[PDB]
Write a protein that binds this ligand. Structure first.
Ligand SMILES: Nc1ncnc2c1ncn2[C@@H]1O[C@H](COP(=O)(O)OP(=O)(O)OP(=O)(O)O)[C@@H](O)[C@H]1O
Ligand SMILES: Nc1ncnc2c1ncn2[C@@H]1O[C@H](COP(=O)(O)OP(=O)(O)O)[C@@H](O)[C@H]1O
Ligand SMILES: [Mg+2]
Ligand SMILES: [Mg+2]
Lengths: 158, 81, 477, 35, 456, 187, 466, 128
């Protein structure tokens, strides 16, 4: 009753999940449970809104495909569906971010990503512009240029 | 726990639907390994529905018990006044 | 006169607060001006709480309560045999008053340790599955547990009907007087049951205590103890009584109602804390007495109804921890046509195995072993085990209202376990069985009579059985 | 109940996680070496 | 005797009587009100006070307001003049057609018939409906749980049962709308008027309606079933009839009893129902039975909370049900009317000792052939096609046109006798109609109609 | 046994014992005598030695009821008052005694028709207007009642007078008048 | 001190004393009764009134009936004269062999031994049961608890322990039946006579018996465990003996407390239990202990209500035991007897420094392979056996063989199975499980391990099957 | 007022869960006997007497109408809670919304399998 009653007093809930923190993704924001009353195309612009809805849709589709992956395994998936799962895992990692206050928890440096850089990076992942880069390139980076640099370094090492 | 039982029920209903569809696909492709797959996924769906029935019985028992336990807590707190 | 009289202070929730009765004892029957009766439950410094054995509609504030001077008791005796009475011993069958000159307290304690002896005599139900695999002895408490409409009452009624062969005989140590306690059942069901017993001529040795679904909850809570006192009258006078409680789930529900209306703390499933004591003090009174105390017995068959087959619930577990074994009736077997729907792998009789007759042991040890192997199996040896198990399962089915003498069960189980049915296809076993029995009943009364007299299958009688089964199975379809 | 099998834990959710990680560590190896 | 209101807490009213307390379950008339407010006595609290549950709203009640003891329980008008009317829990007409003019009143609280008044043998109540009579017959004096709600023709089935019992057995019907939605109550009233069961012009109505709506306090919805049952009890005991009593919904009867018990301050039992759940249900249901004068057979719409059959309310109702009739939407989608699921409807008297060896064998054969047919539908040999054909014909033949639908479909209404039903299904099972097409068994009465329709 | 209920009701232990005694006294037409005896027995009750011995929780109820018995016999009370005191001592409600007493008192407060009515004013108003309100108010009464006025003076009302006649209540104060005008000004 | 009854509610009786209020836990004798009705003082209610719990039925008690204060708690005879005798909750003989002629009486309420009286020695107690000896071995002087639901095998197991340990015992033994079947007490009495352990003709008996069974009112069922404790405490303190104390059932103690907690006017706790459940249980259980003045080995059967192992009573009993044997209904329905749950039974001497590294490693490996099989159960259950690795299949095969090998025929269970009971030594148990674990029997059928004793009988049965 | 004067009104109670919570507060503080989830015995009576007032009048009463659209928030989709059970029992149908359908892109996130209207086609134009 306490959180359930609180929900109706807020304008933009951020719901942190333990299922997400155990993946190692921080902050553990649940993308399919967080809400904002200004997530409106007439407020944030149609590009922002469309990118956000596409991210949420690919994450829900990843959820729906994970059951099929549990039974039939990964090799018996469609090609469109392997592409969905790839882009979904990449988007999961890219929602992660290193915090300036968590520099002791991670050892990483703090990154503060501007808004247009966020929209642009997620649009580029949803478009397929980074199908060739690994998924650990998006884990704990700021803008997408950092994901590219991290992929180049992770390759240059091995 | 009611939440444990709900999670497990959902998981196994999903497994049941997936194996049922795989059986139908195998019975289509069957028109030796395909018949084996058809029977394997049929038996998997049978076992999944069996587990679903047992878990539904457990779920109903547990939710009735939870309602009664909360009522008893409220009644005991009110009778102390 | 506030010593033998009181004035109802308040009434409602089934409980009457009465002012006065300064001389009333705890658990004493009091009587209201409206003809209703009650039990003095709570003696308090200023009032008495009285449990009403009837409807509150009949009691108003200010009504006068006299005391009877007697702790709650019921009439007992053989004058109750053949009568249908309510939970207080009043006749409800319209045949006049019970001519009982003895009364007995319903709340007496069970015999202790020394008055008893181990159960040794068989209580013949007439059901093949029970008498072979789950044998019951005289003095035992065997639970009949199962879902709704799985055949529990049918087992109890077949037992009562079966006792007719013994109650007509001349051996008094072999007679069994039956008590059927109906607790919260439909009244039409009890009337149909009484007619079913009158058709079978089984009422002349049966008492029916009826507290049905429209009776007050205190009456349904009391009916088992009234019936138990009626049966203790036989247990303590050298005779043998059987008592069926149909069922104790409904008595537990009635007691939970009475406890919640008295504002007593609910526990698991809102049952009181002493819902175990409710049944334990009752089923402890079914006992076998040693010969210094008469040698009589009282066998109890409490019935319990489960929900969706859950026997790990509260009241089922309680009664399982009280009784000496259980007969599990399964719904899956009932719907598949296996009747009685006894689950032979879960049904157990802890103390009745030492009571089985010798001939039934001779065939039933083998039958138990073979059905067990069939349960473990489901080559050419495992297919033989499957065949034998299927044949034995078809052999354990039985019709309704027709219990069998022990010698006929022995003959049929013999034909089944020795292997004579293995080339019959299973869908004919039942048919064969009837035919076989008919033959053994008409042309071979002397073999049955000698197996009954010996209690065992002599090798002479074993040879006769072999001859008869081979000669009959020959000229069969 | 879209991610019900892996939100429940147990063998069918842990085996799913292992299979996904196997496939994508394979793909990340065959994607890094091609860079 | 006259008392005065001393406390008003919601729908519970404490009334103090300076002389002569009323017995429990008596009805008390609150004085000085624009509409009639009746209180039912529930407890004697001491100090000449009684606690009562109100049968209507208690707004505007004043402490000290006078209250009159009626000297009996709630009394309702019983008789033929109740047929075609609508009354509420206190026996008032609510159809705006004037006073219900009977010669006799009856209290809604009465005891179940004594043990010596019971009929010692079970018998079948023949309804003239083929699937019911064959596969899950109704016991004369029994309780029938009607499962299935909207979109399966429950109201057409109710009206057809009313009509068939009035025609065949000469007995009337009562319909107790416990917790009835007012919209659906109006709908049912007019559906019954159009199908001819209720007749607003002459005295040939067949059903008496008793409504307790959802906007009524819990006591009203708790006693409306007893009001309907009192009308039915008149028709059985005084007229010697074979009455039908419909109770819709029985779960709402249980819920009203729960709410009443919680308002009276009683500790709730398991799950949440009243501690007196079983004896409430018992003192109601034990009155629906066969006496030596007539019988009352009761069809009771069942709702299962959370689809848990072990819930205390369904599990307490199922202890009394002698039959079960399941209206399925999958059967209605197949065009089969009534939509009675033939494999899920059960009956306790489906027993060779009650219905006869022949009836029982025919019903078991029909059931096995339908099971076999669905077994074959699972995968879609030599005689598998023959069972498929005969099962299609059996399915089509369970259908039947109802009289109460003649103004819609145009076809004539069939009341099939029991012998005709047994014989038709016997012949279809023995292969006597493997030449007729399967569409010749759809919506006919006896089997002669199937052969005459195949002649076309 | 039908009761003679008083005109006003008091509730609780005080109300129950007072109603019981009022009913007992009205059956024998001894109301005024019992009234005077309860006044006296309450003023006896307030005795410090007696109060200390009656409120004491570790004194056995036997000795305490014997003490109340003899100390009522020292007064030569009616049987009704004697039985009341013994009933209060036997039940252990002696602590409520004065409450009970006052309850019975206030019961007969209305039996004599004495209607309690308090007039709050700003500053203590003199006796001329007081007899004026005496006469104009006893017009507010039914058959045979007499006024019990208690003229209170709180100047926080700064004018007018608030009159509480039994349970009727008229607000002639100027504060409510000006606040009502102000609310009409703002609303 | 003479008081009078003022209220009777079931087993609870309020008594009003004018002079001389009796302390808490005193015994009071009701006057005017055919049998002895004893009330134990539980509460002082003020106004010279006490609340008491009756040791027998309170029917026929009247308000105003006289009650005498004995001046001391319930006192039972303690001594060697209690051996071979049966006494009830208040120490009366209930075997009709006449009075118990001891020289001293003890009150059934005493303080538990101090912290400086404790003993730390931990010898193992070999029972002859393979699952107990391997996975959760008992200890001499320890506290053993047998948990289990209704009909899973607590009494069969306690009677097998009486057969295996108490028969060959050096010291004395006390059996307290607390809220169990009276015919089981009759069975045990006559079985101990026909075995010679109770000798009705001389003073050679070695077992005392106390009984308050499920027909007794809740007060007697609440105090009879205390009576058995008192007898065992005399044999431990006043004779230095090594005592065996069998309690069946100890849960009933707690249960009876619940039944009176309602009538004593106490706010209920969780599941409607007394608010004093843990303190009552601890006050009883700390007396069941080993001191440095003598040893008590305690075997207590603990009923688990509705198979709920988190119920307050078993969950609170768990912390009082040195070794716990948890029987399972799921394991029983597979036919494995005793139904011991191998992944739920523990012991505190399961430490390599106590049992040896060989025993410790074998037990740990058995539990590991059983836990692995338990992990695989889901995959096995839906997708079947064919989708496992050959390593998973090998571990399933070995785990099922080990499962069946943990079963064992009991000597007390012959009568309802016919199979002779086997008593397996400890070295044989370690050896057989070590061999099933090493892979020395991966060829035998798993039904050859079912209901045998040592591993040689498994090989013989596998031969006989072929 | 509109329903009685020949006109047509629609009313949306957003939402009735919170009204039930407010009534439960008032009742618990007045010491009325609590029931399941601490709700008083007449919370069904509350919502039912609120919702039976949405009616369609015949032409003899002006022909007006009142349509009610009560809103109910379920917790984790649990329609077997006390107040959802009551209001589902009272109403003539339900429009059920899913959060999985919401995030799948199906918006309005109406679950068509679960939604129902017991009026049905009698409330549709012939074209629709
Ligand atoms: N051995 C049998 N053979 C055939 N039919 C049987 C047999 N036993 C029971 N039945 C049938 O099952 C029906 C219901 O079984 P029965 O009433 O005896 O058991 P029950 O469990 O007590 O049911 P209830 O829930 O009403 O108490 C019986 O009317 C009878 O027709
Ligand atoms: N070691 C065993 N061997 C065979 N059967 C057993 C064994 N233990 C229990 N059982 C079966 O389970 C039943 C219950 O036994 P029991 O110990 O008396 O139950 P409880 O746990 O209630 O004390 C026994 O009658 C027996 O049929
Ligand atoms: Mg029955
Ligand atoms: Mg036991």
């Amino acid at each position: 009753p306490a959180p359930a009653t609180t929900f109706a007093h807020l304008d933009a809930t951020t719901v942190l999940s333990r299922a997400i923190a155990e993946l190692g993704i921080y902050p553990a924001v649940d993308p399919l449970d967080s809400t904002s009353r200004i997530m409106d195309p007439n407020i944030v612009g149609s590009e922002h809104y469309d990118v956000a809805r596409g991210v949420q849709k690919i994450l829900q589709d990843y959820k729906s495909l994970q059951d099929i992956i549990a039974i039939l395994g990964m090799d018996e998936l469609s090609e469109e569906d392997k592409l969905t799962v790839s882009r979904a895992r990449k988007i999961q990692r890219f929602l992660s971010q290193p915090f300036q206050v968590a520099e002791v928890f991670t050892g990483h440096m703090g990154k503060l990503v501007p808004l247009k850089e966020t929209i642009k990076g997620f649009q580029q992942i949803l478009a397929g512009e980074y199908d060739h880069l690994p998924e650990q390139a998006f884990y704990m980076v700021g803008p997408i240029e950092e994901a590219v640099a991290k992929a180049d370094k992770l390759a240059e090492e091995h | 726990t009611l939440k444990d039982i709900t999670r497990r029920l959902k998981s196994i209903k999903n497994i049941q639907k997936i194996t049922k569809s795989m059986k139908m696909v195998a019975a289509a492709k069957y028109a030796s390994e395909q018949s084996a797959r058809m029977t394997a996924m049929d038996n998997a769906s049978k076992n999944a529905s069996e587990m679903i029935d047992k878990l539904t019985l457990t779920f109903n028992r547990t939710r009735q018990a939870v309602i009664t336990k909360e009522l008893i807590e409220i009644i005991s707190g009110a009778a102390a006044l | 006169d506030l010593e033998e009289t009181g004035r109802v202070l308040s009434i409602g929730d089934g409980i009457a607060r009465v002012h006065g009765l300064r001389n009333v004892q705890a658990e004493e029957m009091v009587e209201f001006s409206s003809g209703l009766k009650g039990m003095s439950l709570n003696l308090e410094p200023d009032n008495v709480g009285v449990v009403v054995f009837g409807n509150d509609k009949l009691i108003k504030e200010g009504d006068i309560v006299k005391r009877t001077g007697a702790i709650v008791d019921v009439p007992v005796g053989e004058e109750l045999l053949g009568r249908v009475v309510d939970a207080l011993g009043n006749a409800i069958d319209g045949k006049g008053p019970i001519g009982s000159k003895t009364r007995r307290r319903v709340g007496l304690k069970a015999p202790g340790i020394i008055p008893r002896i181990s159960v040794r005599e068989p209580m013949q139900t007439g059901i093949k599955a029970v008498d072979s695999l789950v044998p019951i002895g005289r003095g035992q408490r065997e639970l009949i547990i199962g879902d709704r409409q799985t055949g529990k009452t049918s087992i109890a009624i077949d037992t009562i009907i079966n006792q007719k062969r013994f109650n007509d005989g001349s051996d008094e140590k072999k007679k069994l007087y039956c008590i059927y306690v109906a607790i919260g059942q439909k009244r039409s069901t009890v009337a149909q049951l009484v007619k079913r017993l009158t058709d079978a001529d089984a009422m002349k040795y049966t008492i029916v205590v009826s507290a049905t679904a429209s009776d007050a909850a205190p009456l349904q809570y009391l009916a088992p103890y009234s019936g138990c006192s009626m049966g203790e009258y036989f247990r303590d006078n050298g005779k043998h009584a059987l008592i069926i409680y149909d069922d104790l789930s409904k008595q537990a529900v009635a007691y939970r109602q009475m406890s919640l209306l008295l504002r007593r703390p609910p526990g698991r499933e809102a049952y009181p804390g002493d819902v175990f004591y409710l049944h334990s003090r009752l089923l402890e009174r079914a006992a076998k007495m040693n010969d210094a105390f008469g040698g009589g017995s009282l066998t109890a068959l409490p019935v319990i109804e489960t929900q969706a087959g859950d026997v790990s619930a509260y009241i089922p577990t309680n009664v399982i921890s009280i009784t000496d074994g259980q007969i599990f009736l399964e719904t899956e077997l009932f719907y598949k046509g296996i009747r009685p729907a006894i689950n032979v792998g879960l049904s157990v009789s802890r103390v009745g195995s030492a009571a089985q007759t010798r001939a039934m042991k001779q065939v039933a040890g083998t039958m138990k072993l073979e059905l067990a192997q069939y349960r473990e199996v489901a080559d050419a040896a495992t297919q033989q085990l499957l065949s034998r198990g299927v044949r034995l399962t078809e052999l354990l089915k039985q019709g309704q209202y027709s219990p069998m003498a022990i010698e006929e069960q022995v003959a049929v189980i013999y034909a089944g376990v020795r292997g004579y049915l293995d080339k019959l296809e299973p869908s004919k076993i039942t048919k064969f069985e009837n035919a076989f029995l008919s033959h053994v009943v008409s042309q071979h009364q002397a073999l049955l009579g000698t197996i009954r007299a010996d209690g065992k299958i002599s090798e002479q009688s074993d040879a006769k059985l072999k001859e008869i089964v081979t000669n009959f199975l020959a000229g069969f379809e | 109940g879209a991610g019900s099998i892996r939100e429940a834990g147990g063998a069918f959710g842990k085996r799913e996680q292992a299979e996904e990680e196997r496939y994508f560590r394979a793909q990340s190896r065959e994607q890094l070496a091609a860079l | 005797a006259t008392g005065r209101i001393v406390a008003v807490i919601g729908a519970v009213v404490d009334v103090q009587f300076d002389e002569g307390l009323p017995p429990i379950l008596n009805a008390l008339e609150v004085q000085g009100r624009e509409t009639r407010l009746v209180l039912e006595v529930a407890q004697h609290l001491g100090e000449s006070t009684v606690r009562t549950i109100a049968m209507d709203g208690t707004e505007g009640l004043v402490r000290g307001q006078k209250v009159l003891d009626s000297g009996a329980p709630i009394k309702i008008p019983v008789g033929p003049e109740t047929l075609g009317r609508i009354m509420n829990v206190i026996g008032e007409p609510i159809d705006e057609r004037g006073p219900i003019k009977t010669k006799q009143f009856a209290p809604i609280h009465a005891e179940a018939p004594e043990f010596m008044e019971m009929s010692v043998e079970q018998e079948i109540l023949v309804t003239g409906i083929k699937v019911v009579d064959l596969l899950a017959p109704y016991a004369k004096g029994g309780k029938i749980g009607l499962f299935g709600g909207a979109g399966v023709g429950k109201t057409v089935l109710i009206m057809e049962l009313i009509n068939n019992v009035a025609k065949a057995h000469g007995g009337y019907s009562v319909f107790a709308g416990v917790g009835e939605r007012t919209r659906e109550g109006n709908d049912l009233y007019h559906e019954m008027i159009e199908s001819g069961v209720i007749n607003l012009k002459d005295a040939t109505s067949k059903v008496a309606l008793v409504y307790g709506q959802m906007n009524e306090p819990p006591g009203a919805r708790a006693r409306v079933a007893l009001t309907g049952l009192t009308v039915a009890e008149y028709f059985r005991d005084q007229e010697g009839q074979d009455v039908l009593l419909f109770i819709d919904n029985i779960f709402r009867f249980t819920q009203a009893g729960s709410e009443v018990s919680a308002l009276l301050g009683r500790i709730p039992s398991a799950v949440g129902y009243q501690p007196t759940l079983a004896t409430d249900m018992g003192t109601m249901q034990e009155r629906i039975t066969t006496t030596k004068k007539g019988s009352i057979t009761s069809v009771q719409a069942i709702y299962v909370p959370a689809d848990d059959l072990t819930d205390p309310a369904p599990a307490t109702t199922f202890a009394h049900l002698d039959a079960t009739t399941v209206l399925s939407r999958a059967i209605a989608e197949l065009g089969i009317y009534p939509a009675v699921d033939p494999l899920d409807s059960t009956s306790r008297i489906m027993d060779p000792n009650i219905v006869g060896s022949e009836h029982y064998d025919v019903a078991r054969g029909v059931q096995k052939i339908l099971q076999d047919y669905k077994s074959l539908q699972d995968i879609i040999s030599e005689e598998d096609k023959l069972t498929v054909s005969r099962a299609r014909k059996i399915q089509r033949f369970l259908s039947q046109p109802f009289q109460v639908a003649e103004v819609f479909t145009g076809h004539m209404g069939k009341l099939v006798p029991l012998k005709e039903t047994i014989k038709g299904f016997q012949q279809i099972l023995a292969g006597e109609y493997d030449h007729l097409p399967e569409q010749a068994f759809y919506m006919v009465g006896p089997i002669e109609e199937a052969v005459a329709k195949a002649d076309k | 046994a039908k009761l003679v209920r008083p005109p006003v009701q008091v509730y609780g232990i005080e109300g129950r014992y007072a109603t019981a005694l009022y009913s007992a006294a009205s059956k024998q037409n001894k109301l005024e005598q019992v009234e005077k005896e309860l006044l006296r027995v309450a003023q006896i009750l307030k005795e410090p030695k007696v109060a200390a011995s009656v409120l004491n929780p570790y004194v056995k109820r036997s000795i305490k009821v014997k003490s109340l018995n003899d100390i009522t016999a020292k007064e030569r009370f009616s049987p009704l008052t004697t039985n009341l005191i013994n009933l209060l001592a036997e039940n252990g409600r002696l602590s409520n005694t004065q409450g009970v007493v006052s309850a019975f008192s206030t019961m007969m407060s209305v039996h004599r028709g004495e209607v309690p009515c308090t007039v709050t004013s700003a500053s203590p108003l003199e006796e001329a207007t007081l007899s004026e309100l005496k006469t104009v108010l006893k017009s507010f009464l039914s058959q045979g009642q007499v006024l019990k006025l208690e003229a209170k003076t709180d100047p926080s009302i700064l004018g007018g007078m608030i009159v509480r006649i039994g349970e009727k209540y008229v607000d002639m104060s100027v504060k409510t008048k000006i606040q009502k005008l102000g609310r009409a000004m703002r609303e």
